Amino acid sequence: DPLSETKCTLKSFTVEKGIYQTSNFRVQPTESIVRFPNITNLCPFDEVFNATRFASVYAWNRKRISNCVADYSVLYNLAPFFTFKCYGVSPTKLND
Amino acid sequence: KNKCVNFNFNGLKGTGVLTESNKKFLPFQQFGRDIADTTDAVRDPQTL
Amino acid sequence: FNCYFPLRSYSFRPTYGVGHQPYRVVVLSFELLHAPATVCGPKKSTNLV
Amino acid sequence: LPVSMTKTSVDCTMYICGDSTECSNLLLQYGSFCTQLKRALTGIAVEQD
Amino acid sequence: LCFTNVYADSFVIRGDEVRQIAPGQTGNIADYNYKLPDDFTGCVIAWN
Amino acid sequence: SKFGAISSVLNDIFSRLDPPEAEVQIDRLITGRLQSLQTYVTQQLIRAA
Numbered sequence A: 001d002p003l004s005e006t007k008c009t010l011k012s013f014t015v016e017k018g019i020y021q022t023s024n025f026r027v028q029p030t031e032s033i034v035r036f037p038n039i040t041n042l043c044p045f046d047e048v049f050n051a052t053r054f055a056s057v058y059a060w061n062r063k064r065i066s067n068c069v070a071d072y073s074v075l076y077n078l079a080p081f082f083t084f085k086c087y088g089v090s091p092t093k094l095n096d
Numbered sequence B: 001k002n003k004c005v006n007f008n009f010n011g012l013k014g015t016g017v018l019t020e021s022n023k024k025f026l027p028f029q030q031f032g033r034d035i036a037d038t039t040d041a042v043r044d045p046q047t048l
Numbered sequence C: 001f002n003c004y005f006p007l008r009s010y011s012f013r014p015t016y017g018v019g020h021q022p023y024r025v026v027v028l029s030f031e032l033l034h035a036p037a038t039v040c041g042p043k044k045s046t047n048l049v
Numbered sequence D: 001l002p003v004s005m006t007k008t009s010v011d012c013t014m015y016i017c018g019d020s021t022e023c024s025n026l027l028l029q030y031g032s033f034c035t036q037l038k039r040a041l042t043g044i045a046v047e048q049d
Numbered sequence E: 001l002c003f004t005n006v007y008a009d010s011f012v013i014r015g016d017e018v019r020q021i022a023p024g025q026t027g028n029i030a031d032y033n034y035k036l037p038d039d040f041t042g043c044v045i046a047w048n
Numbered sequence F: 001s002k003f004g005a006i007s008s009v010l011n012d013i014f015s016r017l018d019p020p021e022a023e024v025q026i027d028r029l030i031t032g033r034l035q036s037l038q039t040y041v042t043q044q045l046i047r048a049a
């Protein structure tokens, strides 16, 4: 009851005459929506990681990765992938 | 539209009611932020 | 498109690398709130003043 | 000569937490900060009236 | 330090997946098979 | 203002950082906003007097 909420707010069973602000109204959502772009194609994350030969320290190669559906869950499930340290990002919430 | 829903639009999570705007956006823009980084407007990546 | 027996074997093989070798581990579970006296350490007692 | 001011009231959930649910769970671990601030502006609003 | 009681959950896993038996992560054996809450307190006895 | 945290919005740091790390930056933003709300009423209490 709204009268019982005044007894919990002021912490007293005998509530005197007056006006009291107990709580605030808030309409909670009933549905849940998510929108992602219409792409489906996979991009060469596998080719950059599992290439045959690699570049040296100087003149490093940089692959432009854009317009794909990324999927990191196929990356860090590999057996020689020992360490995985991230910066400003948690390693588990990478797919979202 | 026209109901308060939990929206997750390209990583921006939150709660609010969405309605069709009358705003004249330029095509290079994709987001409209109000006073003090308030997410006032958004463009969906599907039908734009 | 999705079909295997749900319980899969670990495929025990000693030639694996050390970062994926089978290691038998047991975990413990102890609560950290107000404890009734059931599990205590080796501390002795002293008379009450 | 001024007599009164603009009476105001501020909420904590829509200001600090905004639209997040996880912020409302952690803010109750802080005590009675928002009960102090709501009664103070209420005590202001009855004073200027 | 005193506690209420101490348990022992015996299982076998391999070397690559020892980190996600911990409060607040995800995984193949963490999500659907063996999970533990966000306020868990315990030690891993990992011998060779 | 970010108050020295990663971002000014709090919904994304709950979505980007893990809860072992994300409540550290949330407690930075909560104590920054609770100090912002406490000082605002305190300047109001001097002005209302």
Ligand SMILES: *[C@@H]1O[C@H](CO)[C@@H](O)[C@H](O)[C@H]1NC(C)=O
Pocket (backbone or CB within 6 Å): A038, B045, B046, B047, B048
């Ligand atoms: C995304 O693809 C769908 C395919 O049905 C199309 O209807 C929609 O217009 C596309 N959106 C773009 C290209 O922004």
